[PDB]
Enzyme design. Sequence first.
Site, PDB file in Angstrom:
ATOM      1  N   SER A   1       0.798  -1.223   0.000  1.00  0.00           N
ATOM      2  CA  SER A   1       0.000   0.000   0.000  1.00  0.00           C
ATOM      3  C   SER A   1       0.834   1.279   0.000  1.00  0.00           C
ATOM      4  CB  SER A   1      -0.646   0.018   1.411  1.00  0.00           C
ATOM      5  OG  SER A   1      -1.611   1.052   1.586  1.00  0.00           O
TER       6      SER A   1
ATOM      7  N   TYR B   1      -1.849  -1.063  10.907  1.00  0.00           N
ATOM      8  CA  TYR B   1      -2.122  -1.614   9.609  1.00  0.00           C
ATOM      9  C   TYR B   1      -1.023  -1.232   8.642  1.00  0.00           C
ATOM     10  CZ  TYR B   1      -3.722  -2.212   4.800  1.00  0.00           C
ATOM     11  OH  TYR B   1      -3.886  -2.552   3.455  1.00  0.00           O
TER      12      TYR B   1
ATOM     13  N   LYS C   1       2.217  -3.472   6.911  1.00  0.00           N
ATOM     14  CA  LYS C   1       2.493  -3.582   5.472  1.00  0.00           C
ATOM     15  C   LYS C   1       3.969  -3.307   5.147  1.00  0.00           C
ATOM     16  CE  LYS C   1      -1.200  -5.084   3.347  1.00  0.00           C
ATOM     17  NZ  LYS C   1      -1.288  -6.415   2.691  1.00  0.00           N
TER      18      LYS C   1
HETATM   19  N1  LIG Z   1      -9.131  -2.396  -0.434  1.00  0.00           N
HETATM   20  C1  LIG Z   1      -8.155  -1.493  -0.182  1.00  0.00           C
HETATM   21  O1  LIG Z   1      -8.507  -0.302  -0.080  1.00  0.00           O
HETATM   22  C2  LIG Z   1      -6.686  -1.791  -0.048  1.00  0.00           C
HETATM   23  C3  LIG Z   1      -5.561  -0.784  -0.363  1.00  0.00           C
HETATM   24  C4  LIG Z   1      -4.196  -1.197   0.093  1.00  0.00           C
HETATM   25  C5  LIG Z   1      -3.882  -2.537   0.226  1.00  0.00           C
HETATM   26  N2  LIG Z   1      -4.912  -3.552   0.333  1.00  0.00           N
HETATM   27  C6  LIG Z   1      -4.581  -4.966   0.636  1.00  0.00           C
HETATM   28  O2  LIG Z   1      -5.052  -5.750  -0.445  1.00  0.00           O
HETATM   29  C7  LIG Z   1      -5.342  -7.111   0.015  1.00  0.00           C
HETATM   30  C8  LIG Z   1      -6.760  -7.300  -0.448  1.00  0.00           C
HETATM   31  O3  LIG Z   1      -7.698  -6.333   0.156  1.00  0.00           O
HETATM   32  P1  LIG Z   1      -9.259  -6.529  -0.198  1.00  0.00           P
HETATM   33  O4  LIG Z   1      -9.823  -5.128  -0.443  1.00  0.00           O
HETATM   34  O5  LIG Z   1      -9.604  -7.432  -1.299  1.00  0.00           O
HETATM   35  O6  LIG Z   1      -9.716  -7.040   1.253  1.00  0.00           O
HETATM   36  P2  LIG Z   1     -10.628  -8.309   1.514  1.00  0.00           P
HETATM   37  O7  LIG Z   1     -10.997  -8.139   2.959  1.00  0.00           O
HETATM   38  O8  LIG Z   1     -11.758  -8.256   0.588  1.00  0.00           O
HETATM   39  O9  LIG Z   1      -9.810  -9.646   1.132  1.00  0.00           O
HETATM   40  C9  LIG Z   1      -8.970 -10.163   2.174  1.00  0.00           C
HETATM   41  C10 LIG Z   1      -9.197 -11.704   2.113  1.00  0.00           C
HETATM   42  O10 LIG Z   1      -8.345 -12.169   3.131  1.00  0.00           O
HETATM   43  C11 LIG Z   1      -9.024 -13.252   3.856  1.00  0.00           C
HETATM   44  N3  LIG Z   1      -8.176 -13.424   5.022  1.00  0.00           N
HETATM   45  C12 LIG Z   1      -7.909 -12.529   6.005  1.00  0.00           C
HETATM   46  N4  LIG Z   1      -7.065 -12.930   6.907  1.00  0.00           N
HETATM   47  C13 LIG Z   1      -6.742 -14.221   6.477  1.00  0.00           C
HETATM   48  C14 LIG Z   1      -5.862 -15.152   7.040  1.00  0.00           C
HETATM   49  N5  LIG Z   1      -5.163 -15.090   8.156  1.00  0.00           N
HETATM   50  N6  LIG Z   1      -5.807 -16.376   6.454  1.00  0.00           N
HETATM   51  C15 LIG Z   1      -6.567 -16.480   5.271  1.00  0.00           C
HETATM   52  N7  LIG Z   1      -7.398 -15.710   4.605  1.00  0.00           N
HETATM   53  C16 LIG Z   1      -7.438 -14.556   5.338  1.00  0.00           C
HETATM   54  C17 LIG Z   1     -10.366 -12.649   4.073  1.00  0.00           C
HETATM   55  O11 LIG Z   1     -11.423 -13.541   4.536  1.00  0.00           O
HETATM   56  C18 LIG Z   1     -10.591 -12.054   2.666  1.00  0.00           C
HETATM   57  O12 LIG Z   1     -11.479 -12.683   1.711  1.00  0.00           O
HETATM   58  C19 LIG Z   1      -5.243  -7.029   1.553  1.00  0.00           C
HETATM   59  O13 LIG Z   1      -3.963  -7.354   1.971  1.00  0.00           O
HETATM   60  C20 LIG Z   1      -5.357  -5.452   1.827  1.00  0.00           C
HETATM   61  O14 LIG Z   1      -4.586  -5.076   3.011  1.00  0.00           O
HETATM   62  C21 LIG Z   1      -6.241  -3.232  -0.028  1.00  0.00           C
HETATM   63  O1  LIG Z   2     -16.828   8.133   4.815  1.00  0.00           O
HETATM   64  C1  LIG Z   2     -15.852   8.581   4.296  1.00  0.00           C
HETATM   65  C2  LIG Z   2     -14.722   7.814   3.845  1.00  0.00           C
HETATM   66  C3  LIG Z   2     -13.703   8.468   3.280  1.00  0.00           C
HETATM   67  N1  LIG Z   2     -13.731   9.893   3.138  1.00  0.00           N
HETATM   68  C4  LIG Z   2     -12.537  10.563   2.482  1.00  0.00           C
HETATM   69  O2  LIG Z   2     -12.264   9.889   1.254  1.00  0.00           O
HETATM   70  C5  LIG Z   2     -10.841   9.774   0.945  1.00  0.00           C
HETATM   71  C6  LIG Z   2     -10.565   8.311   0.707  1.00  0.00           C
HETATM   72  O3  LIG Z   2     -10.814   7.730   1.996  1.00  0.00           O
HETATM   73  P1  LIG Z   2     -10.756   6.053   2.150  1.00  0.00           P
HETATM   74  O4  LIG Z   2     -10.993   5.807   3.594  1.00  0.00           O
HETATM   75  O5  LIG Z   2     -11.665   5.531   1.100  1.00  0.00           O
HETATM   76  O6  LIG Z   2      -9.248   5.621   1.759  1.00  0.00           O
HETATM   77  P2  LIG Z   2      -7.896   6.225   2.234  1.00  0.00           P
HETATM   78  O7  LIG Z   2      -7.317   7.235   1.268  1.00  0.00           O
HETATM   79  O8  LIG Z   2      -8.002   6.784   3.650  1.00  0.00           O
HETATM   80  O9  LIG Z   2      -6.955   4.900   2.342  1.00  0.00           O
HETATM   81  C7  LIG Z   2      -5.598   5.156   2.125  1.00  0.00           C
HETATM   82  O10 LIG Z   2      -5.072   5.745   3.333  1.00  0.00           O
HETATM   83  C8  LIG Z   2      -5.126   4.949   4.549  1.00  0.00           C
HETATM   84  C9  LIG Z   2      -4.384   5.797   5.580  1.00  0.00           C
HETATM   85  O11 LIG Z   2      -4.430   5.134   6.852  1.00  0.00           O
HETATM   86  C10 LIG Z   2      -4.482   3.547   4.303  1.00  0.00           C
HETATM   87  F1  LIG Z   2      -3.035   3.661   4.191  1.00  0.00           F
HETATM   88  C11 LIG Z   2      -5.183   2.928   3.084  1.00  0.00           C
HETATM   89  O12 LIG Z   2      -4.643   1.643   2.814  1.00  0.00           O
HETATM   90  C12 LIG Z   2      -4.961   3.818   1.858  1.00  0.00           C
HETATM   91  O13 LIG Z   2      -5.572   3.218   0.688  1.00  0.00           O
HETATM   92  C13 LIG Z   2     -10.124  10.487   2.082  1.00  0.00           C
HETATM   93  O14 LIG Z   2      -9.871  11.910   1.724  1.00  0.00           O
HETATM   94  C14 LIG Z   2     -11.201  10.415   3.233  1.00  0.00           C
HETATM   95  O15 LIG Z   2     -11.026  11.527   4.159  1.00  0.00           O
HETATM   96  C15 LIG Z   2     -14.770  10.696   3.574  1.00  0.00           C
HETATM   97  O16 LIG Z   2     -14.764  11.914   3.501  1.00  0.00           O
HETATM   98  N2  LIG Z   2     -15.825  10.000   4.132  1.00  0.00           N
END
Ligand SMILES: NC(=O)c1ccc[n+]([C@@H]2O[C@H](COP(=O)([O-])OP(=O)(O)OC[C@H]3O[C@@H](n4cnc5c(N)ncnc54)[C@H](O)[C@@H]3O)[C@@H](O)[C@H]2O)c1
Ligand SMILES: O=c1ccn([C@@H]2O[C@H](COP(=O)(O)OP(=O)(O)O[C@H]3O[C@H](CO)[C@H](F)[C@H](O)[C@H]3O)[C@@H](O)[C@H]2O)c(=O)[nH]1
Lengths: 338, 338
Positions: free
Chosen positions: B124, B149, B153
Amino acid sequence: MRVLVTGGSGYIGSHTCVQLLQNGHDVIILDNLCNSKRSVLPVIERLGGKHPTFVEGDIRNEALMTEILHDHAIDTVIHFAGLKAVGESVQKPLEYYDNNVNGTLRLISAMRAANVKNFIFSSSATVYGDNPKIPYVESFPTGTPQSPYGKSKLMVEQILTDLQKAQPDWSIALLRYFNPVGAHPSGDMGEDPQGIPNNLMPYIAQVAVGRRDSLAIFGNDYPTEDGTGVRDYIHVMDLADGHVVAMEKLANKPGVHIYNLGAGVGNSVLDVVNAFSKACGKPVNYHFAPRREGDLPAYWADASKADRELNWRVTRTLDEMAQDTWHWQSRHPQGYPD
Amino acid sequence: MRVLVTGGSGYIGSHTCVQLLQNGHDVIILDNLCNSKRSVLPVIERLGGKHPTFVEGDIRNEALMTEILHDHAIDTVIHFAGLKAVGESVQKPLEYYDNNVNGTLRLISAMRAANVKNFIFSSSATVYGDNPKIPYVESFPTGTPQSPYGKSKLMVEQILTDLQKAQPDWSIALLRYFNPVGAHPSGDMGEDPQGIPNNLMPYIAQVAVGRRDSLAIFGNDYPTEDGTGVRDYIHVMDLADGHVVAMEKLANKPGVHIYNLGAGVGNSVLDVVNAFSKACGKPVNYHFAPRREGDLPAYWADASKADRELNWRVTRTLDEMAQDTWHWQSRHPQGYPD
Ligand SMILES: NC(=O)c1ccc[n+]([C@@H]2O[C@H](COP(=O)([O-])OP(=O)(O)OC[C@H]3O[C@@H](n4cnc5c(N)ncnc54)[C@H](O)[C@@H]3O)[C@@H](O)[C@H]2O)c1
Ligand SMILES: O=c1ccn([C@@H]2O[C@H](COP(=O)(O)OP(=O)(O)O[C@H]3O[C@H](CO)[C@H](F)[C@H](O)[C@H]3O)[C@@H](O)[C@H]2O)c(=O)[nH]1
Ligand SMILES: NC(=O)c1ccc[n+]([C@@H]2O[C@H](COP(=O)([O-])OP(=O)(O)OC[C@H]3O[C@@H](n4cnc5c(N)ncnc54)[C@H](O)[C@@H]3O)[C@@H](O)[C@H]2O)c1
Ligand SMILES: O=c1ccn([C@@H]2O[C@H](COP(=O)(O)OP(=O)(O)O[C@H]3O[C@H](CO)[C@H](F)[C@H](O)[C@H]3O)[C@@H](O)[C@H]2O)c(=O)[nH]1
Ligand code: NA
Ligand code: NA
Ligand code: NA
Ligand code: NA
Ligand code: NA
Ligand code: NA
């Protein structure tokens, strides 16, 4: 107090157990014996003047940790267990992250489970990273350790920190050690590394006992007074005393208490060799070799904080450190018996 | 290729599994279902046009991981599994370090055991920390994430890095995601968060479907063009395509390949709301609230590296992202069935 000392049969732990027992605490040692022998136990009790309970096991076994914590109604835990060979950590990173990061994580997770909330962690000046500012003060932000070993130590300080924030009732001490050396004054307990010693003082000691030919002085072109590396060496007995004090005064005092534990002054490789030559009655053989990879030139601790807050300062000198080491080396050239 | 996709039943993983299957790879999904339902499986196979094998289990079970790796003759592993609720990580740090740090550690340890040496990790932009320089470029040194979190990472990127150094034959991709949003174009697969959504797009979607009253816009006094936070949103389908390409082109290419995966441009909260209002046919209700703790004002990715090296760039637009999300939300207001 009732204290679980993980790694308690190791170099630093053993000495701390002795001091702890001397202060009348009830000690439970948890150790997996990967880097120590059970033969030290009887010495701990003898020098400690009281029996410590020993449990053979691994910090990574959370179920076992939890059980021990409950079973012995532990009030505080001093965590010395882990792996510490820098070079090896570069070669085998996973083992370092598993033993140190996961290892500590399982251990505090068990604590949580057993409602234990007082912790003391063996940290290191490595967490300061490549800091040009010396001496190192706890107010400096941490840097980037260069080995997996160092990194693992900083990762734990960070996890511990976040944990405390989430469980504000915990008291967690981050004790940053500098370069521990020396041995118990009786000459019957000391560092007993297996194989080639990675640190300076035991290497010198082995050269002196007749085990090794010559000490390789890593580097002689450093921007120091004599060209050799400068560090802050601290007697293991002072370090031990510092752990008892920190345990005693910080217990139930909510917060993350960070303290450098050092003498507060630097000594070069030559200074150390010279002190050892004097302690052993013969000139220690040595030669200059190239700098070792990842070695900083000069650093030492600013230990005013611990003086101020814990009323703790070192009391042993460099000559003692050398004398005590030689006395142990010389009294027990084969270390602890198998 | 034979690929184990951990977290494959989750939001990002599911979509990547579909694309992977479309490209004719053999997919094994490993998921513990803590944050997804088995009901997505049939959809993956239908949209993927091929059957993926599913294994219910935890990345923290190294024995099981090793078995699966051997059993399915896996060539590469794409690691999406872990916990990702930022705020929750502040409240429950240990669970984040266990699932993410230990979790990945056990998983690569199993890889080592089974001789698997191709890895892709879900990283991330949080790893860049509080960087005033924007856009973020992979050449920047990492900073200090502000949540457990984020820290977890960065810790994994570091362990992965040291591992590669010790086992130089491994190919490890560090894929730094920005803000993933959107859903499969069919409207039958999408993000299905349980409870209050923490991210912007699903929150907006729930407001629009009639589940929530109004969107709270965290902050309106940022030094941005409209006062609202600016981020780089990327369609989950582009992200998915990026993972297939990276897997295909980096396999057996020794090194630690770090790529930002983003659109390379920023959009403010209002821009996003506005696109959603347009996609759903009605003005999305919202109001301004105070800034959320730990929120940076504006950042986006510089994605030239991946364009150059992997020939990958996003192809979906912000309007698509919103349209696709609404279509899924609207087609499946209860998400995946229990
Ligand atoms: N969605 C985002 O905004 C975001 C941005 C930055 C990074 N990430 C990373 O991307 C990856 C995917 O995120 P996502 O949005 O698809 O989330 P997600 O919650 O949809 O997918 C995570 C999957 O991990 C499984 N899981 C969790 N812990 C586990 C464990 N110990 N053993 C096995 N399975 C396990 C969950 O049941 C799930 O289906 C994650 O590592 C998340 O940290 C996502
Ligand atoms: O209900 C909401 C949710 C989000 N936001 C705004 O929408 C933007 C996006 O917010 P998200 O929560 O959707 O995602 P983030 O940008 O906060 O997430 C990013 O920043 C985080 C910082 O802790 C983590 F690093 C995360 O993995 C990374 O994708 C930000 O300006 C946030 O302030 C709102 O105003 N209202
Ligand atoms: N000696 C130094 O120069 C130095 C300086 C900085 C920090 N440290 C840290 O201080 C602590 C003590 O170091 P030491 O010099 O006494 O080392 P040591 O090797 O003598 O003691 C470590 C003890 O840990 C035990 N152990 C290791 N992994 C274990 C595990 N998973 N489960 C249970 N027991 C386990 C070993 O068998 C051993 O007796 C360690 O964490 C070390 O990293 C020491
Ligand atoms: O055979 C030897 C051993 C050491 N030295 C020199 O002696 C000094 C002390 O070396 P040690 O290996 O005894 O200890 P370190 O100062 O290297 O250890 C410190 O630095 C390490 C950096 O990786 C770790 F962080 C470690 O925990 C921390 O105490 C250094 O100038 C070193 O170059 C020699 O010349 N020859
Ligand atoms: Na809290
Ligand atoms: Na050894
Ligand atoms: Na011996
Ligand atoms: Na190596
Ligand atoms: Na949720
Ligand atoms: Na549902």
